[PDB]
Amino acid sequence: AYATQGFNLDDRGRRIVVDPVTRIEGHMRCEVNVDANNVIRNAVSTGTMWRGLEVILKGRDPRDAWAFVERICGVCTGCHALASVRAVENALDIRIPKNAHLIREIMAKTLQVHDHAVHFYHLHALDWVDVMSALKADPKRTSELQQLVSPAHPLSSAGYFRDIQNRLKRFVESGQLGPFMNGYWGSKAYVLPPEANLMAVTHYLEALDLQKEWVKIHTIFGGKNPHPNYLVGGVPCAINLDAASAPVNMERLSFVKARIDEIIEFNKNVYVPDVLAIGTLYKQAGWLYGGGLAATNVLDYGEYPNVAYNKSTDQLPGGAILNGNWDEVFPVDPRDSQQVQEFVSHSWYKYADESVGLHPWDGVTEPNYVLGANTKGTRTRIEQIDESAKYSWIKSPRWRGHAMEVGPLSRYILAYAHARSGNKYAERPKEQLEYSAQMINSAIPKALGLPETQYTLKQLLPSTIGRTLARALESQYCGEMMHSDWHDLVANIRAGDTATANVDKWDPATWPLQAKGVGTVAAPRGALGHWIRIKDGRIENYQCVVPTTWNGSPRDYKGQIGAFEASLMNTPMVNPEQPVEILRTLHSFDPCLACSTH
């Protein structure tokens, strides 16, 4: 047993293993220990895959790098391409034209919406929603609930809900339950009434239908989704407004705006209201577990500047908060060797000296798969992993030595802190947060006949509910932003600026003989960076530190735990053989394990 970051870790209790963790991207194992009353007292995050993409890049052309690193992940597709082109542009002192900037921002914000909404409905919802209880719902009373939760949503009739319920009952009676087979349905961990469950299942189906339209924005600008094309120096999608021969003309831009408008409707009428409703009911049940590090230490690089290349105009302004002091946002510099560092003390890699964290410009990725002395099982048949030694393919990133949570919640905490200190670019997330708190505390309880509560944003936000809420709010904000970006794009083109690529430094004969650069992105899951060194036209070093690397990290040299492990601590389980609460909290980070290990 030992104490770290206010958490009293203890492994003497009953060990529980979850391998595979399902409804994530990629491969993860989780182990916990519970006390005599089934409360988690120890938690162990293991990334169970590695591909070695950083080493594969060595010796290749920096201009090709984006396509390789894009294949780190097909879920957060393109965010690695963006980080890569930004890193190469930073190394080579390349400034992209306005239209390329706006198109990249539209693509980024489209990914944010798609990733957030599909995650919630496709992967997260079943941790909160009992699908078998939806079968016991009254279609009339489900229709009445839909009017209270979101009056503007047109899909609301009793008959609409009744038809959905029948096809669910048919699928269920078939005997082929498919993805619902052997679920944890009927656990006391589920608290929603039948009508709220049927409503959620219905919106699941709407989300899965509509998500294929949203990504057509990537297809226009980038050729395909997943894995749209990017370009060092700009975008490949050249413009000619008024002709059908260029990649982008007015008709294609009108198509993009139609897709954006659809996104705005879905976020405000379906997604945000559902999360507010589910959040309220779980708050009423007292389920405010899962805060972990969000209560103390959060980080994001900052993103979406109003004015290209002017970080003071970031619409999701970043930095670092420590010790839960929201009145003091520290600035974060990706270039500073004493700020972002990665340890491998408890990871399956080796450094010359593993008591030191390496800034990614000096990063090293040399595998070392070895299991500690206290392992139960063998090298190829693990029964119980030994977290006192090396236990994950994920490295351990820290900021000035501190363990941080990253992601939409971190961004929303940072935005709120910035707004409090006078920042005028964070007004919208602040408004969203205050609206959401009033709904969760007062308006929704009033409408459902529940007691009003008085939780502050400082109490609500650092929780699994809060982490889920911030994602939905971020989706809404991203759709609003890209709607504005679209207008600015069309206005700039109509005024006569059609430029999409700066090719002045395309030829490697123009490059400095050595250079280093960093590109950062506010990716869906948090703070993404790519650090590159270029020597004689080739990649000399390429290191990625990815949001799920931060959140899913194993312990560091000092033994400090990362966000996943912290978030599971101190949580009761209804039934230690059913990982309902573990999955609910882990899924609130939207874990991407391929991203985490690359």
Binding site: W50, I56, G74, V75, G222, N225
Partner: protein, 261 residues
């Protein structure tokens, strides 16, 4: 009905994401897919084993990603064991095996030089089963659903080319019906990004387009319900459906001997 069991090795999950973009069709009992299942851990593992017994030699195994042979196979761990062990176990009683995407078909990005995990395509590990390769990074959504639909309608694998790819989707090179072909035929090329030629949609050969040596349905079926494809949106094909495309030189280096095409 024939169940489809979907396994995941070393992968980025693009093929799974592509599959859910299909418009036509939007049939199976997807009784195992780790990315979708309600159950986790031991309960997910148990679901897998019940289906294999009940439908012996009458389920389809679909594989996304690939197995690593380095690190004693523990660079991809499922249920505390190497992925290759799960792959071989499930393959043994499958009626047919689908290798989704370039990862399962050939290796894809993790198999690019120097391949630190010795990632190996499915057909090099499973050698005694009917396999179909569906390459691409990822494949087109309608190609993936088209393959499954054929197999479920007809209870057999469709006609394959010598490389194991379905002729119904991989018989043509991109360059055969690419809409920029008349420009290629007239010597009309982009030379620099966003040049006048690029704004007129001229051929991308001199910008590195690998369409002339790449078999896929991208120029006709196109992507995301026929919205666009790489070339239409202005970037050359990078060859993503062809074996070893990451190690065929820079994506921006042109093919040699233009007259061949």
């Amino acid at each position: 009905r024939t169940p489809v069991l979907w396994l995941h090795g070393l992968e980025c999950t693009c093929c799974s994401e592509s599959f859910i973009r299909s418009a036509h069709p939007l049939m199976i009992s997807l009784d195992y897919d780790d990315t979708l299942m309600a159950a986790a851990g031991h309960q997910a593992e148990a679901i897998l084993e019940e289906i294999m017994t009940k439908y012996k030699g009458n389920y389809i195994l679909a594989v996304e990603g690939n197995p690593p042979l380095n690190q004693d196979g523990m660079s991809c761990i499922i249920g505390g064991r190497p992925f290759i062990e799960q792959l071989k176990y499930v393959a043994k009683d499958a009626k047919a095996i689908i290798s989704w995407g370039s990862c399962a078909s050939w290796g894809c990005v993790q198999a690019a030089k120097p391949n630190p995990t010795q990632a190996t395509p499915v057909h090099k590990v499973i050698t005694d089963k009917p396999i179909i390769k569906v390459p691409g990074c990822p494949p087109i959504a309608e190609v993936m659903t088209g393959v499954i639909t054929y197999m479920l309608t007809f209870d057999r694998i469709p006609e394959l080319d010598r490389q194991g790819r379905p002729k119904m989707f991989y018989s043509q090179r991109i360059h055969d019906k690419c809409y920029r072909r008349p420009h290629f035929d007239a010597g009309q090329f982009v030379e620099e990004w966003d040049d006048e030629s690029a704004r007129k949609g001229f051929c991308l050969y001199k910008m590195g387009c690998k369409g002339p040596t790449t078999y896929n349905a991208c120029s006709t079926t196109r992507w995301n319900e026929g919205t666009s494809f790489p070339i239409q949106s202005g970037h050359g094909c990078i060859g993503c459906s062809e074996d070893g495309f990451w190690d065929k030189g820079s994506f921006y280096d042109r093919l040699t001997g233009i007259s061949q095409f």
